[PDB]
Design a protein around this nucleic acid. Structure first.
Ligand SMILES: N[C@@H]1CCN2c3c(F)cc4c(=O)c(C(=O)O)cn(C5CC5)c4c3COC[C@H]12
Ligand SMILES: N[C@@H]1CCN2c3c(F)cc4c(=O)c(C(=O)O)cn(C5CC5)c4c3COC[C@H]12
Ligand SMILES: [Mg+2]
Ligand SMILES: [Mg+2]
Ligand SMILES: [Mg+2]
Ligand SMILES: [Mg+2]
Ligand SMILES: [Mg+2]
Ligand SMILES: [Mg+2]
Lengths: 482, 208, 482, 210
DNA sequence: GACTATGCACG
DNA sequence: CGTGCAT
DNA sequence: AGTCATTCATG
DNA sequence: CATGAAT
């Protein structure tokens, strides 16, 4: 009716349970696909439901609830909130979810409720899922025990670096900034040819982060330190033009701001300086952003030191800030502080297991069909005899022992033949089959090569990484300086 | 509540009365901030015929609305001391959208009569289809489809192009043609008395 | 760029627009299946999804989102709140939804949030959907114009009366109380045999409402009035025992209360009588209800006129209320006030439409096959020549054409024949086929009779109604008096 | 917020601290209104090892726990003036359930040491399974000879809860006793304290990620 | 349908 | 102080 | 995750 | 004042 427990021997068990879980399965990304599980499920789920870039939008509530009843047993709102972020193009460098309707803003105001918005996977996310139908990735049982889910996605590009993460667990947290997709691929590709690549060389391809929010990044030194140890402190500064106004008045105009910064607060906190007269000479602050462009006018008074105002704002507001790398992720089930190399290596590693897994799957398919086709080619030259033989059999099974015994077909061939629809006897054309049998032998040859030669496989992996780069490559947004 | 225009200007400034916090949100985004303010109507506007003038003034959407227009209510109402050249009611192209337009319109007829008779009260016609079409007759001619179920599924750049752009927008103006035929019409649909309404509905609504 | 309309003309198109919709398509039940469109959508969706009484419960959020994306384009909350109500056994006489978890109480504390609860259709609910898959009810397009949805359900029992409806719209409202399944079915069966049946006689079978909260319904005359004109004011009074307590004191003990009455608010409003002492003699009010019993003890003082108190509470609380019939429903797309008679009449007419529709369907199926089977029985008489004709044909199309022209097979059979799997050639048994040919001819004769004989048809309808009664019938809860 | 027991009585009355309003409400229905009180813990509970005693006295859960147990808090805490003879923590059997147990316990330890030291702080073990009921994956596999996998408390109807966890003569129940007083201050401080390094290291030393 | 407070790690 | 999955 | 207000008809 | 689908 009652058992007793130590306070020590309890907090131990309890907190250890929550510690483990919130680390492996909540707050930190897998080092290969760059996803926290809630994100992976959203993606796997929408994909299963055919909710993709090429097809109509689904009401969000439908996507969410299906997630929540098939894979993720948590708040509907948490799931929605996550889904919304993956769609905000000022937090993700390369957005994974497209969403019709109010999905927030840089001004921080809240997105429309899950009942109003429609959504679907971005074309890019498709590549995160590529080949999943092909037994290329380890599946686990879902909380129900009713359906298998993937533990990691195939990742046809290296999501972790491209879209970043962040990041608060127990005993560990993570902040990984987003990166220009093309650069990361350039790095990965070099490292594929050059396993032992030093950070310095990789940095000729992958020079630093590329924020979707744009702006100026400063600190080659700390960027190296970060790419080496997983931690570093870089500086992000706002992009700023200076316009002359009539009457000898000048105007500081802001066109880009620092990652993770709320435009609306920033604007107040600046007007806050003006109001408090903290720095001499500010006439008026004005957010002049509109549906197609960010723009903050900080018009100053006549005879005002414009370099004094700008410098003060950079220091005492968020017009310029510190970004801190804290690159933590989950490798062999453990949290792991990691730099550029443990990342790209793990990615390449994984891209390997996948291409290998995929290539067996396809080989085996092609083998089985080649087998059937080989049988169908013989059948044709003995069509009549075969028909006659079947006609003479007592039933289905007997027709097969007869096809075997009399013509040495295999079970699998016999089955194929015996289940052919009558009208097929009008398709008696060997040369089309002989063309497929050839198509097939070549396919099997190519795949076998992939499977038995590490170099051949890595070149596949480069051909593909490049294809992705050609398809999704876009210009840098953040400039660098040191 | 209110997201205000940047610069105060009676001659240009427009007041958008949006049905919904959600759409209120796409409006803040798609608008032109220099002269377009946004006031969301969160929930169904009170009926200003049925309710008591006591509970009418203790109403949040009625307060912030009399106060955001700055002319006051009743006959203590100065149309010269307004705050907007135009006032724009923007709702979903749905039934409840219709209902809301219907309640807002009785409030202005009842408690700001000058504004409607001065032609300052409008109604935005959002698109029904997507080129863009407003009628099922304007679409089939455009076939030579995304079906908007409400403002909430429209993106800011789209909302502007189709219904907020003072140069691209279709815009209905409310007028009082026969003052006394408008008091009956209003008092029957929105009044406290049920039976007259039923008959009206029976006589004019074709159930087919 | 800008066009004007009259106030008189703008309130017209707006209020007429809304009115029509909120009457035909929101607040009021179809007179035949008893459902408002939201409830119907809820049941049809869950059913399409196999979320049925015989299968694991689903997370409510999955169901709700699926309703919202396929059929009901409105609040996820509204939809849920509806779903939850169809599962509260104290609002519905016969609940259509089974929900695991906090779904509320007679104390009217709110149900657990959509994210916690699970649900499925009740067994009886299935009977509302019986035969939907046989083209027995008109379908329309959803809002999407992507999926059809039923406009009314097949209603294998008469839900409108059994479960009730309420009921606020524009220009109209509706209050129909629930009734005993068995009593309603008994009435409908009588009317089937006796179309012109008078109320007085129908009331021998269906004497009054049967609230699921039971209690006492007083006013045989107004029940009549209501069954006649669809309006009528009856009294509902709580079931009360009186216990003596060791002290010369007495206790009033409530065990059943009035439909739609909140137990927690009642108990409070009664204690308010005690606390204000509007009436002398109340010592304590105790809600003593547990998970398997309702029980409110009103402990009186010594020398305290218990008749006087009980009467006061019946008057000045909801211990006793009036219930007003306002039976409005949708007959022919129109709001219509109706009494017992057009209700049973419309039901019966509906069940006829269904049974006819259903029998045409099953018949068309039986025929399409019996036709095939005829062809096959022939093919065997001429197997060798049919194989030769296919062998000699150029392709599926040409073969079908040859079977038609050379042997008078029809398309449908020529299709069947040509798409037979080779192993079928093994068989020559014409008997088994013949047995099926018989079973099929019999089935068609049976179904044709139904369609062609109004009485055969009505007999079937009675038979079915009775099965439903034998299966789901349960005793009265509310007693009657005048 | 609080649902009181119908009869005051420190000798029998139980206080149920339930994870969340949904389940708090299921418990409101399944309880025995004569001696069982329910107090919903709406949300994650404040870490009283990290936060400043100021922000602590200003937190609604802690205030309405201290002021319904009727014994004040801290060193001005009379054990004799309590209201309940058994305080029952009842949380979903999930990780975040486990997390709450962690936080509530650190609080009693920290600001009501006399209440646990006297064995008045219990923990309800809800059922993990239903095919009857089973608590351990081992207690399960034995039933399949003689499965609804409870994902939380909010998925159970009231007559279910009462029978398996709330009914005093049918419930399994943990009693939190303190064995090594000085070896708890350390176990608690490592895990719930402000300093982060120790906790990271304790996780590295005890949690097997396998 | 927007609002409100917590945990967790990190400058 | 704010970040983002959780309660 | 509970909470707040309004429509609509009726007694 | 409470009802139940809607904003
Ligand atoms: N005591 C706290 C103040 C209010 N509050 C919230 C909340 F603010 C947000 C949320 C949410 O945003 C939220 C979500 O689904 O995203 C869920 N909850 C509830 C489970 C706690 C919230 C709660 C819980 O209620 C109590 C606490
Ligand atoms: N101005 C009103 C006060 C608070 N309130 C509610 C509300 F109380 C409930 C609800 C709901 O229960 C509710 C639901 O989906 O069930 C929806 N809304 C919003 C669409 C109006 C509600 C709103 C709207 O916000 C403003 C109004
Ligand atoms: Mg939240
Ligand atoms: Mg700064
Ligand atoms: Mg709408
Ligand atoms: Mg609501
Ligand atoms: Mg009364
Ligand atoms: Mg939980």
């Amino acid at each position: 009716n009652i058992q007793n427990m130590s306070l020590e021997d309890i907090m131990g068990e309890r907190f250890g349970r929550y510690s483990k879980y919130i680390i492996q399965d909540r707050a930190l990304p897998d080092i290969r696909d760059g996803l926290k599980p809630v994100q992976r499920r959203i993606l796997y789920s929408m994909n299963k439901d055919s909710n993709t870039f090429d097809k109509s939008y689904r009401k969000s509530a439908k996507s969410v609830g299906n997630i929540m009843g098939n894979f993720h047993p948590h708040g509907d709102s948490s799931i929605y909130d996550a889904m919304v972020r993956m769609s905000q193009n000022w937090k993700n460098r390369e957005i994974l979810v497209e969403m019709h309707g109010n999905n927030g803003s840089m001004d921080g105001d809240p997105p429309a409720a899950m009942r109003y918005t429609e959504a679907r996977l971005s074309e890019i996310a498709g590549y995160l899922l590529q080949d999943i139908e092909k037994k290329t990735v380890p599946f686990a049982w879902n909380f129900d025990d009713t359906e298998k889910e993937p533990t990691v996605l195939p990742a046809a590009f290296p999501n972790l670096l491209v879209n970043g993460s962040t990041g608060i667990s127990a005993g560990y947290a993570t902040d990984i900034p987003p990166h220009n997709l093309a650069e990361v691929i350039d790095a990965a590709v070099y490292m594929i040819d050059h396993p032992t690549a030093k950070i310095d060389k990789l940095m000729e391809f992958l020079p630093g982060p590329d924020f979707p929010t744009g702006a100026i990044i400063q600190g080659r030194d700390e960027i190296k330190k970060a790419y080496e140890t997983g931690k570093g402190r870089v500086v992000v500064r706002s992009k700023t033009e200076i316009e002359k106004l009539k009457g000898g008045k000048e105007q500081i105009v802001i066109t880009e701001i620092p990652y993770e910064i709320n435009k609306a607060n920033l604007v107040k906190k600046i007007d806050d300086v003006r109001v408090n007269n903290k720095v001499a000479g500010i006439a008026e602050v004005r957010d002049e952003s509109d549906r197609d462009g960010l723009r903050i006018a900080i018009e100053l008074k006549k005879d005002a030191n414009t370099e004094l105002v700008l410098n003060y704002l950079f220091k005492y507001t968020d017009l310029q800030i510190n970004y801190n790398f804290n690159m933590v992720a989950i490798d062999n089930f453990t949290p792991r502080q990691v730099g550029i190399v443990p990342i790209l290596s793990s990615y390449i590693a994984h891209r390997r297991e996948v291409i290998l897994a995929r290539s067996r799957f396809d080989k085996e398919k092609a083998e089985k069909r080649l087998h059937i086709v080989e049988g169908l080619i013989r059948v044709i030259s003995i069509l009549d005899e075969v028909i006659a033989l079947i006609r003479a059999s007592e039933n289905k099974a007997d027709a097969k022992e007869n096809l075997k015994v009399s013509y040495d077909f295999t079970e699998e061939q016999a089955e194929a033949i015996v289940t052919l629809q009558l009208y097929r006897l009008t398709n008696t054309d060997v040369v089309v089959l002989q063309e497929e049998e050839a198509e097939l032998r070549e396919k099997i040859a190519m795949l076998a090569a992939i499977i038995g030669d590490e170099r051949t496989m890595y070149n596949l992996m480069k051909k593909e990484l490049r294809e992705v780069k050609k398809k999704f490559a876009t210009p840098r947004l953040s400039s660098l300086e040191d | 509540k209110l997201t205000p225009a940047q610069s105060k200007n009676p001659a240009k400034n427009e007041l958008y009365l949006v049905e919904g916090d959600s759409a209120g949100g796409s409006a803040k985004q798609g608008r032109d901030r220099k002269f377009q303010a946004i006031l969301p109507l969160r929930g169904k506007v009170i009926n200003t015929a049925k309710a008591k003038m006591a509970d009418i003034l203790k109403n949040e959407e009625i307060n912030t609305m009399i106060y955001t227009i700055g002319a006051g209510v009743g006959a203590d109402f100065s149309i010269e001391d307004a705050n907007y050249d135009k006032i724009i009611i923007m709702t979903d192209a749905d039934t409840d959208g219709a209902h809301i337009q219907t309640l807002l319109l009785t409030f202005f007829y009842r408690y700001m009569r000058p504004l409607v008779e001065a032609g300052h009260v409008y109604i935005a016609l959002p698109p029904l289809y997507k080129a863009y079409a407003w009628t099922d007759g304007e679409l089939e001619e455009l076939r030579k489809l995304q079906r908007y179920k409400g403002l909430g599924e429209m993106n800011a750049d789209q909302l502007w192009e189709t219904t907020m752009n003072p140069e691209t927008r279709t815009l209905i103006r409310v007028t009082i043609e026969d003052l006394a035929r408008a008091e009956r019409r209003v008092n029957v649909l929105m009044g406290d008395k049920v039976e007259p309404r039923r008959k009206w509905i029976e006589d004019n609504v074709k159930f087919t």
